[PDB]
Ligand binder design. Structure first.
Ligand SMILES: N#Cc1c(Cl)ncnc1Nc1ccc2c(c1)CC(=O)N2
Ligand SMILES: N#Cc1c(Cl)ncnc1Nc1ccc2c(c1)CC(=O)N2
Ligand SMILES: [Cl-]
Ligand SMILES: [Cl-]
Ligand SMILES: [Cl-]
Ligand SMILES: [Cl-]
Lengths: 124, 4, 124, 4
């Protein structure tokens, strides 16, 4: 086509999706990770995660308002990844990298798994 | 705005 | 913070949101523009448009599944803008620029209004 | 990935 493109559009959309999340506006699911709960938008989760894409395209699970993650999943690891989904920013630290990588593997977030593998290999 |  | 950022994340999220829209997955509103209907996600509309942000933060309108636009709104103009919302790409042409600009003004999409004003001024 |  002969379209023009607004460079910052995708980033501005994501910034507004994060603002809606922070204000709990039109959030439609709560992700339970052991004792912790995280409110989010199903569409954003599906757009970032192979696991959530599978869950919310399921004819029964698409209608659930609560999703309970595997008890082995670390809440801080999940929190860091949920923030990454809504911002493109990953708070990767020596103290959380193992939890972040295991959570990204479970959530099927290949690019996060990739940078975790690379950061781990550099320290060995 | 750009030509993509 | 000490975060790392994945450059393509925002663009990949938007591409997946557009794929969900095309497959009518978790769409939660229909926008009626005279004889035409457009299915979309409220969160994406709010993230792109001052008008939709106002409508869906309203305590009554947030719960509506159908929104009827002003009868003066051109369906093709709306279609071009809805595509822009989900892709960052604006199909701006001599034959549609007036309709696109009027629709962007109504929807409160300042950057689109700006490029329409500039393209119009260049042709006078 | 970059340093933002
Ligand atoms: N929502 C949506 C969606 C669609 Cl529509 N099409 C294709 N992928 C989608 N999302 C999704 C699937 C697999 C993975 C990710 C996202 C990130 C990753 O590492 N794996
Ligand atoms: N959703 C959301 C949203 C939030 Cl949370 N905060 C601030 N603006 C939001 N969206 C929104 C408001 C005004 C305009 C646009 C988008 C594009 C434009 O030209 N005007
Ligand atoms: Cl439920
Ligand atoms: Cl990823
Ligand atoms: Cl309704
Ligand atoms: Cl805009």
């Amino acid at each position: 086509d002969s379209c023009i493109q607004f460079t910052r559009h995708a980033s501005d959309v994501l910034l507004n999706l994060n603002r809606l999340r922070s204000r709990d506006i039109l959030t439609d699911v709560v992700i339970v990770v052991s004792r912790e709960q995280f409110r989010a938008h199903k569409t954003v989760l599906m757009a970032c995660s192979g696991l959530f894409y599978s869950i919310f395209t399921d004819q029964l699970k698409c209608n659930l308002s609560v999703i309970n993650l595997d008890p082995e999943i670390n809440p801080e690891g999940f929190c860091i990844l949920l923030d990454f989904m809504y911002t493109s920013r990953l708070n990767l630290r020596e103290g959380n990298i193992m939890a972040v990588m295991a959570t990204a593997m479970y959530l099927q977030m290949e690019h996060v798994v990739d940078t975790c593998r690379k950061f781990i290999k550099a320290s060995e | 705005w750009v030509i993509p």
